[PDB]
Amino acid sequence: ERLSTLIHQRMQEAKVPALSVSVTIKGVRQRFVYGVADVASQKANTLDTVYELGSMSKAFTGLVVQILIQEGRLRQGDDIITYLPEMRLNYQGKPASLTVADFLYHTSGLPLRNENLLFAPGAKFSYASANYDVLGAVIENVTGKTFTEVIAERLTQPLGMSATVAVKIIVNKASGYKLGFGKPVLFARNHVPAAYIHSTLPDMEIWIDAWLHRKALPATLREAMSNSWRGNSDVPLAADNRILYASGWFIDQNQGPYISHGGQNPNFSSCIALRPDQQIGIVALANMNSNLILQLCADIDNYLRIGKYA
């Protein structure tokens, strides 16, 4: 019957040592912080505990690419070769053509030179985490700066997300655990844009708030946020999935707009979901990789939408 029972039950069923969840609706927000950030040391999961975002880093990368487009320093249509001269890619026998968009929207067909594509670029949606390391490079080639600097310069400092960092060790970072019979501790520079932004719950709340009040930020950010939520429709959709991919977010119109993404690292998992017509923002951070954490934001959304999750 209760939101804390749902969250605590999912935490146990998923066997994640620590779970932090934040839920906001109509400007009322509650936090659910459970468990331990480090098992052996019995260090409690606190508001300060730092998590890996995994694929939820892609929304940060995607927003920056959008800011750069909004400024005229880039276009989605731009050939990738101009920014990454080295990486030429193959399809059939023929050297393929690739655009920034192909990376943003996961239509690249990446199985990085001398490589064969799974399909002609633009032909299909196929999620490849590597697509956003490519855009990490692009953002570097464009600004002449490091990804880490651009993220801090463009997004975290202006938004005041002090504990959020794209890392080129960080205290307060929870231990990462894997799952076998029982949970063994398991606690990559080119892969940070796709998967290695680190943040805290309060900082992810700030991020959620900026997206929920994006009409009241400086125009450059605001127009880039709008464009960030434009899903790519020029792909085949499956019979039971017509959801679109936008800049590091899944966009679903069913009982929507419902805007979301999961994070799935070796040792960490997470999910974020926004329903901006009701001012709903949900974020979950966990220190273990579980498929149930990925579904947790949708449980919470069901609970808010109809009072049922079972």
CB-based contacts of 143: which residues, under 8 Å, 6+ apart?
68, 149, 150
Identity of the amino acid at 96: A
Q: Are 193 and 135 in contact (CB under 8 A)?
A: yes
Q: Alpha carbon 87 to chain centroid distance? A: 25
SS3 211: helix
User: By C-alpha distance, which of 223, 214, 197 is closest to 159?
Assistant: 214
Q: If you write DSSP's letter for every residue of 114-148 in order, what string do you get?
A: SEE-SS-TTS-----TTHHHHHHHHHHHHHSS-HH
SS3 8: helix
Per-residue CA distances from 35 to 141, 157, 298 (Å): 42, 30, 21
Distance CA 5, CA 165 (A): 32
Tokens of 212: 């929920």
Sign of CA dihedral 294, 164, 248, 302: positive
The domain of 177 spans 1-310
Q: Are 269 and 186 in contact (CB under 8 A)?
A: no
Instruction: Look at strands 89-91 and 115-116 and give their pairing.
Output: parallel
Query: Nearest 5°: phi and psi at 239?
Result: -55, -35
Cis peptide before 257 (omega within 30 of 0): yes
Secondary structure letter of residue 154 according to DSSP: I
Q: CATH code at 309?
A: 3.40.710.10
CA torsion 104-106-107-113 (nearest 10°) is 90
Distance CA 144, CA 146 (A): 7
Instruction: Tell me the CB-side half-sphere exposure of residue 170, using CA atoms within 13 A.
Output: 21
Method: X-ray
Tokens of 97: 């053509």
Helices and strands of the chain, counted as H and E runs? 11, 14
Q: Which conformational region is residue 70 in: left (phi greater than 0), alpha (psi within -120 to 50 degrees), or beta?
A: alpha
Instruction: Look at strands 165-166 and 197-199 and give their pairing.
Output: antiparallel
Secondary structure letter of residue 162 according to DSSP: T
Distance CA 116, CA 2 (A): 51
The arrangement of strands across the sheet holding 258-264 comes to 43-44, 28-38, 18-25, 280-286, 269-275, 258-264, 250-252, 244-245
Per-residue CA distances from 17 to 2, 10, 176, 288 (Å): 21, 12, 9, 7
SS3 237: coil
Resolution given for this structure, in angstroms = 2.2
SS3 267: coil
Count of domains observed in the chain:
1
Query: Nearest 5°: phi and psi at 175?
Result: -65, 150
Distance CA 264, CA 138 (A): 23
CA torsion 189-193-199-202 (nearest 10°) is 170
